Design a protein around this ligand. Structure first.
Ligand SMILES: [Ca+2]
Length: 50
DNA sequence: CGTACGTGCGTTTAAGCGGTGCTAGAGCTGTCTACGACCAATTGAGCGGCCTCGGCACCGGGATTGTGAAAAAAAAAAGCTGCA
C-alpha cells in the first residue's frame, strides 16, 4: 500500500481531503479526481505563500 | 479671477419598431456502463505526549540618523551715484 498523495506526487493528504469533501455537505457524490485536484491547489497556494 | 460647464438652439444619425426568414444549438428521451458508494479487513500515516537546545526576546552601549535653532554665504532687491 502507498498513499494517493504519493501516486499524485503531492505532500498534501489526498485521502483526508476526499473525506472532508464527503463529510462537508458539498455534494452527494465525489469524483476520484476531485480531491487530487484540490489537494494540489491547496499545496500550490501554500507553497506560494511560504 | 478665469473658463469649465450647463443651456438652448438647429442638424444629423441610428435606435427602435414591426416584420420576415434561417438554423445553431438548447434541451429533451432513451440505452448502456464505467465509475463511485458501500462494506469489511487490514495496518500505516498521523496524533498526543515529552524532552532537547538553538533561535529569538531582551539588554546595554556605542554608532548613526535626523531635526531644529541660530548663525554664515549669497542672492537679491531696493536706494544712491554718476551717466552718454
Ligand atoms: Ca507533535
Amino acid at each position: 500500500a502507498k498513499t494517493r498523495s504519493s501516486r499524485a506526487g503531492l505532500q498534501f493528504p489526498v485521502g483526508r481531503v476526499h473525506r472532508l469533501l464527503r463529510k462537508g455537505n458539498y455534494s452527494e457524490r465525489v469524483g476520484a479526481g476531485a480531491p487530487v485536484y484540490l489537494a494540489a491547489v491547496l499545496e500550490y497556494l501554500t507553497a506560494e505563500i511560504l
